[PDB]
């Protein structure tokens, strides 16, 4: 009654010379089924807690596959344990072949990078009160609407420059909502694999234009989760 912890799905064979280690230090295997390669390890439990430790093990199996050449992949969300290969075939594979082939077409030769921009939220709020209009530092609804809309403008002036100036090196851009209070941009870019060096330098030359006003967090190597999504197919019962 060991199930299968699944890490990702790849279009090509992965050789056994690619040594890999996963959750609980289990060895990681590949398993080809009709031209789809599933990277997996033996699951001891049915469920794994998303502890910091386990999330790192999961993330590194896929990153290590990418470092070894297997850059096109659907990466799976942490925790995916299925009972047996029959269930992998009937539920995960058979109904999804076409979407998985399309998806491998879109990702081939491409990579996800991310850009998170932070500013000093407090400082830029007080700096904005000192601007062109300056009230005294109910109709409380009106005034809290006017600050919130003029704050958005001040963010969006920064954001827009980064978006106009990086978008030309990318095939697709997906923006997500701020995680922290200081975060003003959280964007994933899908770029040709060989655009990374120029992208990296472009990010840096844009930042130089804003002086020490921003913190930039650029991740240049990650499994492509934002751009590898599978919509639901019909399942008969």
Author numbering: 2 to 138, 151 to 250
Could you pull the original sentences from the published paper?
Gas vesicles (GVs), a unique class of intracellular bubble-like nanostructures, are found in many aquatic and soil microbes including halophilic archaea, photosynthetic bacteria, and heterotrophic bacteria. As previously reported, formation of GVs is related to a conserved cluster of 8 ~ 14 genes (termed gas vesicle protein gene cluster, or gvp gene cluster for short), encoding two major structural proteins and several essential minor components that might putatively function as chaperones, nucleators and regulators. In addition, GvpF is reported to be a structural protein localized at the inner surface of GVs. Here we found that Anabaena sp. PCC 7120 possesses an intact gvp gene cluster, which shares an organization similar to that of previously identified GV-forming cyanobacteria.
To further investigate the putative GVs of Anabaena sp. PCC 7120 from the structural point of view, all Gvp proteins, except for GvpA and GvpC, were successfully overexpressed, purified and applied to crystal screening; however, only the crystal structure of GvpF was eventually solved at 2.55 Å resolution in the space group C2221. Anabaena sp. PCC 7120 GvpF is composed of two structurally separated domains, both of which display a fold in α + β class, followed by a C-terminal tail inserted into the middle area of the two domains. Further structural analysis showed that the N-domain of GvpF displays an architecture in which a six-stranded β-sheet (β1-β6) is sandwiched by two α-helices (α1-α2) and the helix η1, whereas the C-domain adopts a modified ferredoxin fold owing to an extension region consisting of three consecutive helices (α4, α5 and the N-terminal segment of α6). Moreover, the additional C-terminal tail provides an interface for the N-domain and C-domain to pack against each other, resulting in the structural stability and correct folding of GvpF. Superposition of the two structures showed a very similar structure, except that GvpF of Anabaena sp. PCC 7120 possesses a shorter helix α5 in the C-domain. Besides, structure-based multiple-sequence alignment revealed that GvpF proteins are highly conserved among diverse species of cyanobacteria. It indicated that Anabaena sp. PCC 7120 GvpF might also function as a structural protein involved in forming GVs as that of M. aeruginosa PCC 7806. Moreover, structural combined with enzymatic investigations suggested that GvpF and GvpN are structurally and enzymatically conserved, respectively.
